[PDB]
Amino acid sequence: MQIFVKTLTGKTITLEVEPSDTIENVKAKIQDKEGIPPDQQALIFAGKQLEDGRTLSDYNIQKESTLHLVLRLRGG
Amino acid sequence: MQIFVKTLTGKTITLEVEPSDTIENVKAKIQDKEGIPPDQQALIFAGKQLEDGRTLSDYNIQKESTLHLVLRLRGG
Amino acid sequence: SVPTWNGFSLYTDETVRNAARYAYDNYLGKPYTGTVEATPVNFGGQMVYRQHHGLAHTLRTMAYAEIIVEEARKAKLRGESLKTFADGRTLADVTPEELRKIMIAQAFFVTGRDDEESSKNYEKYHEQSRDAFLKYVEENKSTLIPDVFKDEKDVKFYADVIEDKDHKWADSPAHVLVNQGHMVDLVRVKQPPESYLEYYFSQLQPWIGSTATEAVFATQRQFFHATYEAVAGFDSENKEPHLVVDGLGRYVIGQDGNPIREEGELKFFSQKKKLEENQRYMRVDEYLKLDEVQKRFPGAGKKLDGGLPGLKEYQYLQRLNSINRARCENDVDFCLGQLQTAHHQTKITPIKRAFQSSSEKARRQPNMDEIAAARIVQQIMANPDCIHDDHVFLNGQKLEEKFFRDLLAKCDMAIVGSLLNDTDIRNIDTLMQHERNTEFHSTDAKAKPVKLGETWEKTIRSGGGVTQIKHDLIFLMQNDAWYHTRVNAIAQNRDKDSTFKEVLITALMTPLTNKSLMDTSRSPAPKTLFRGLDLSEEFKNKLINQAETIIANTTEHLFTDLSTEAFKQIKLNDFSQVSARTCASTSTNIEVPRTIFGSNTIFEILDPDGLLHPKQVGTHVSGSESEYSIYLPEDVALVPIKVSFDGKTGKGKDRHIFTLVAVKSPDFTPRHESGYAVGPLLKMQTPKLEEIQRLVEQAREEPDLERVFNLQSRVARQAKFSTESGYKTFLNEKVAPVLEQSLNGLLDNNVTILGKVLSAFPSDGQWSAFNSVEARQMKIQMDAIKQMVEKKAVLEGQILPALAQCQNALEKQNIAGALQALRNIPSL
Amino acid sequence: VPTWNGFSLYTDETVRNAARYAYDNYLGKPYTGTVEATPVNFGGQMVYRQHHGLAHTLRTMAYAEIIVEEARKAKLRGESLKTFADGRTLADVTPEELRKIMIAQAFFVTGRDDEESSKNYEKYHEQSRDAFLKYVEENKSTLIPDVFKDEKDVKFYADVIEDKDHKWADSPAHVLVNQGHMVDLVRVKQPPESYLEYYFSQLQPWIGSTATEAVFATQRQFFHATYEAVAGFDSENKEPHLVVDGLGRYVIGQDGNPIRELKFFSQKKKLEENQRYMRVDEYLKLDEVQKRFPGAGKKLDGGLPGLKEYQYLQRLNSINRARCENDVDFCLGQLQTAHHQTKITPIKRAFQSSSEKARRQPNMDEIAAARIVQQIMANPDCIHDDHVFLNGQKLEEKFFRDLLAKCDMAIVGSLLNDTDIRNIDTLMQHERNTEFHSTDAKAKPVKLGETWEKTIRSGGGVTQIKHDLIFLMQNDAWYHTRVNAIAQNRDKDSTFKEVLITALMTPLTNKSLMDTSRSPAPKTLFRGLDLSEEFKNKLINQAETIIANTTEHLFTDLSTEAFKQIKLNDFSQVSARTCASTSTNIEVPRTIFGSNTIFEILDPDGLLHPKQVGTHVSGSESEYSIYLPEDVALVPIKVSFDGKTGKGKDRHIFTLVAVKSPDFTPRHESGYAVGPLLKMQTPKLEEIQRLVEQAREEPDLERVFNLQSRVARQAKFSTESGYKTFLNEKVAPVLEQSLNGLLDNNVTILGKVLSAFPSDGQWSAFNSVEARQMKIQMDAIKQMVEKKAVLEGQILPALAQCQNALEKQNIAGALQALRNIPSL
């Protein structure tokens, strides 16, 4: 199974996963492929924000699905 | 019927009465013969003080019974 | 197995005194016709012809007979076994009739003396005494036979006793009583004293017992004092030689160092007998220490003072030479009076020895609970609206039945009555109005209920001032049985089926009646009163038993004090209660209880020490009840000294007279827990401080902060438009800052801020500069803001801290700092 | 009336290309004919075709656009517009149809060889048609069929351009193209009143009077935006009326009235004595004219307001005029800015204005609420599950929802300080295990306090805390969904602790944002929502009603109706009451979150005070938070269909303009927060109620009796003589008196039995064990009695006198009651 996470800057990042993966896993993947520190990553699917610890299958993100990732930082 | 009223000063007063006579009346008779105003008279029979209004027959005083008379007055 | 005495007494029987008068008139008061000591003598100018064997001696012998029988009966009642005569009787079985005959004989026993000769004319003098007796009987045959003496053979029995032909001094009660009656007297004459005291003691002792014998000889010394005869001492350690009285002999101690005993037995020695060298007489000290003497005489190691206590030897001798001695020796009535007073006192002194003494005759001062009870009574009286049917409700406390039965049981309601005033008395009329239809019930179930207040208004109360009310109240007590029987039963805690209101009325009117009596009575306190009761045969017999036990265990003594047993039996058997807790009705004329009311029980209450404080009830004209009321003090007991059978009532039941003596002692005080009345009074007086709690309720009211904030907007909108030159620079400059600062002070509760913006509020003269309608409106508003700020600055910055520190200073007991907190308040 | 799709002359690429081609190949090309072939010059730049060049063409296109806009608005208001043969109205023109219309308009005048009018009409429009079909052919790929359905479509619009038979009213295309060109004339022609009234006559039946007024008002704004002179209009002008059809005149002659068959008169016809032409003023005062033209009695100023005649004329000869006549993008930009402005000025004309852009200053209940939040923050021990218990008063759910509903929580936040910020950590402590619930019921409950410390809070000073709080809001949906739902009073099944946390955090969050944001406020923001189909449809209806009743005007001001419908249909509260999340990049709400509703919020006058959320590096959400001021409404000016979401739902974009007016203030009854605060400031005053409690203590009489009983035992037998004279006369009476004094609590007795107590030297006369022991007990009894006489005889009368002075307003005497205590 493979999914794509798309960004606001336009780029489409492709990831290898399976549903028993958590989202801890997915942001680690994205960090390995794009150098994106995991605490800066906010992942959204079908409008809903995904939470660390819970798995990919729990949110019913299936094969070829598209997640969206935005950078979210504290100010200052 | 006749009864005797005995006094502390020694005198024995003989009265002819009737069993239906009241005690007011008996004190009136005593007043007529010995001049003792009835308001001063305390009559006793067999240890009991006799009350105005009640009759001689009420106290079971019968022929030749003996009553006792003491003077009883308010102080001052 | 002791029959009840009937009140026969040497001091009140007329026959016995007639015999004594005759004996004196004819023989005793007449000169001695013989030789030895025939010469008359003088006491205070009066003559006595017979000094030693005259009237006083004879009357004393008869007095001895009376006390010997009394103590014999007491001794059989205690369980002692007395010596019997041939018939099987003891001296305890002597009857009043027999004692009268004995006493008449005693009266003549010495009349036959021609002088004071002893050793020579005993037969002749006693023959003449016998002849005197029979002459008297003959001259009075009418009165005396057969009523006193049943026939001439009776008379010859007593004449034979007087003759004393065969010295059969122990044949009968008459022989013992006459001879030892004459013997007991022998004491005054003989020295050495101990020898004589022991010997006579030894001859009486078998017949009545040691306790009884001790009582006889102690009373004897009292009779000696009352008839002006000298009283010797007694010294167990006396070193004089013993006198063997039976034979006027001696006992001797030889050279060897022991008493000469026969083949054992002390042997008699003549005083004329020749004495061996270094042989000596037995002294009294050695006689009283022999074992046989100690086993029969409790005088060993004891000593008694001679003369009268409290009297100098010189004035004792002065008293012995008084004219009263000649009165005793020549006036039968006077001498019998002296003896009667001594005899009566010997029945009281043992009682007072058994308990702690008391010095004060008055009732004690009020305790806590009596003071409180008096206050609660005055309050119920002044405000009768508080009396409900089940309780009294006063100043937020609820007093129920038992609170008032507790007052009736634990307070001296006389002492309480002494704390009330004339206005409580006057308030009786109001109480009676409130209780107009409260119904009282006599304890006699054949009587109908009476309404209290109504009867008070329509029959008892007679107008007038307070004293008249007091008399009217006393008259209610004296005259209305439906009232006083219920009241007495309740006060004495012996009532059945009483209403709450009956109990309350009793509790209120017992002290009020006592106050009425104490306030109105003027008569001197009588010292003999009579109280009649109609008791059941069961209860009366119980009281008879208790009184006889008490009396039988109260005895005089010489050497052996049995006070502890008198204390034990008096506390087991006292029935003072049946005369306690209420205003008990009594009369000075025994015929009121005996004849007018027909009581089967009469208490003859004697109060020689003035401890009862009776008060006159009603009038005391001839034919009246001669009534006095007694409210028995908590520490006074009416102790029985005699019980007499007095005949039968009009209804045929037996009538008895108990003679009681009032005796005051801390031993008779009851113990009651304090607080039964003090508590409720203190809870009534806990103060409702509503002015304090409305001070705090004013301290918690919210300021109108919305008003100050709105006012800031009005100062602003009124500030945007000018009016006076200048008026709005004044608003921007002097008022809007004050409103800001006031708001900030009020937003917090900082009293520093409010205290300084108080000074920042502009003056009235600064406001007088502007005359517009809105200017004056706004000064009114600013005044209101300032008042707000001021109330918060004063309360929170000065008053409430002052009260906090004052409180803290009193809670540390620092009263001076407590007032310091209030008056040394600093200004802001 | 169907919903528009956002098609606009100013953003469609095809129409702009058509304008460029028309410009490149014809307009701006030197006239090959005679009349006014001479170019003219503006600020140094040359324009070859001054009157019928590019700016005129673009204006024609713009007129067609607003004519359709106002037509649709009038049909939505219920007006009856003139029908064609189909039964269609101008309101029925679709976006695609309008694109074809305007494209035709771009070529409608390209076929001119010069500026000759009277003759050569047929020829010039033949040349225009030839130009149009040349353009179509050369872009046949792009154009067909996507723009034009087929070649016969193209011939229809070519036929309208040719205009052979002058069928001006046949279809929407004919009307829009011909009257689009007609409206531009209303410039040069004198006199103004006559011409404006005539052109108004001809447009009016198709869209209505309201719409026509809006068209010509917008028209003058377009003239200003493309540097064309703007005439005045004078209802009282005394020039002669010009009958526009035939350029004739009206007269009256002898008869006072005007000459009627109105009777048309040529200008060449000269007639009788004291007969003259009808003047402009009397033409506009005829009833037939007033009933169809609201120009009577009205006047409009020429030129630009605020501009001197010298300055206005200087602006008219600026180079920007030639830029408008030669630069397609520049001229469309001018027209677009004017068009956008005409949707805003009616709105603000309808409400009272304000000069202050900032939030107002606090009202009393906002101040009090700020204090209550500072106190709760200061002592979190007062938070229970059920209710808040602070200074003896109990605030439950209702009180805090009342604060969220009635206070400007931003203004409240402006009254908190850095200590309140710092106390966030302590409150969190205290709520370590409190569970928050996302509004998504498939989300697990997440402890609050715990999570705050575990994952959010990063140390540092107050500013760091502020950033941490803002981050909690930005990052934790289990938190911000519950919080927002509660603040807007649209929550289901919230716990009290959730309501309270929202009440405390909304002002503190506002403070953090205000203090930390450094950005100058952006003036376009986008906010995304996922609404139900029904709710969205309601919002569309309300917005369309508002828009349809917001129109420009020349003579007849309908601001009162705009005010009425805006207050009936306002949905500002959908963006109110909470710290609302927005982005400057429409793709955040459109593409990342997939919202079916997008509010394009415009804030040109800077009234929203948005504040920056987080950092905004590339790829961030570019988030700003808005806490809508109480007196700002977000008024709709456009509703466009934008396609569909990832889930297939319809997506709409509402364009809203922020508008500040006292008219939008809510009315709230006061006191909801001041009251509870006042209850909290009332004193406990426990030392007073313990003064009362000790003032009701029973005296210990037992002790008193004990001493008199002991005095009795020792006051009866003492072999020493003076000890007993002292004991009976000096001690036992004092115990007497005192025992009665305590018993009746009569202060007169106690106050003087104080003086009868023996001195220490009087007691020192006896050195026995029990004598000293007794002196100590006597001393204690004396303290009792004295304190008792002091309390009931001095202090409590003083406190009563003080109180009585307090209820009588006599404060000074109230203090005097305390300081001037009388001695016993």
Ligand SMILES: NC(=O)c1ccc[n+]([C@@H]2O[C@H](COP(=O)([O-])OP(=O)(O)OC[C@H]3O[C@@H](n4cnc5c(N)ncnc54)[C@H](O)[C@@H]3O)[C@@H](O)[C@H]2O)c1
């Ligand atoms: N009792 C007297 O000797 C006496 C003297 C003078 C006047 N009075 C007059 O008689 C009336 C008062 O009569 P009272 O004093 O007999 O009334 P009371 O209430 O004292 O007693 C009445 C009866 O109650 C019974 N009783 C009283 N105490 C008892 C007890 N403790 N235990 C068992 N029974 C008890 C006895 O029968 C008693 O005679 C008034 O008219 C009073 O003036 C009586």
Ligand SMILES: NC(=O)c1ccc[n+]([C@@H]2O[C@H](COP(=O)([O-])OP(=O)(O)OC[C@H]3O[C@@H](n4cnc5c(N)ncnc54)[C@H](O)[C@@H]3O)[C@@H](O)[C@H]2O)c1
């Ligand atoms: N444009 C945006 O909404 C936007 C922009 C930038 C960042 N975010 C991020 O999204 C999260 C916050 O999302 P949010 O602001 O969309 O959630 P927020 O609490 O508004 O609520 C989101 C949803 O609640 C419902 N809702 C909101 N208001 C409603 C109302 N008035 N009536 C009925 N339903 C209503 C709708 O489903 C709405 O989409 C944070 O991570 C924030 O940074 C959102």
Ligand SMILES: Nc1ncnc2c1ncn2[C@@H]1O[C@H](COP(=O)(O)O)[C@@H](O)[C@H]1O
């Ligand atoms: N032991 C005794 N018993 C009885 N009576 C005695 C006794 N001794 C003396 N008397 C009496 O006293 C009288 C004698 O006196 P005298 O002879 O001095 O003892 C005798 O009459 C007796 O009556």
Ligand SMILES: Nc1ncnc2c1ncn2[C@@H]1O[C@H](COP(=O)(O)O)[C@@H](O)[C@H]1O
């Ligand atoms: N009443 C009208 N209705 C529609 N279009 C008009 C009208 N009057 C003029 N026009 C347009 O403007 C041009 C007429 O200008 P003129 O010839 O100056 O009247 C024609 O080409 C029409 O396209």
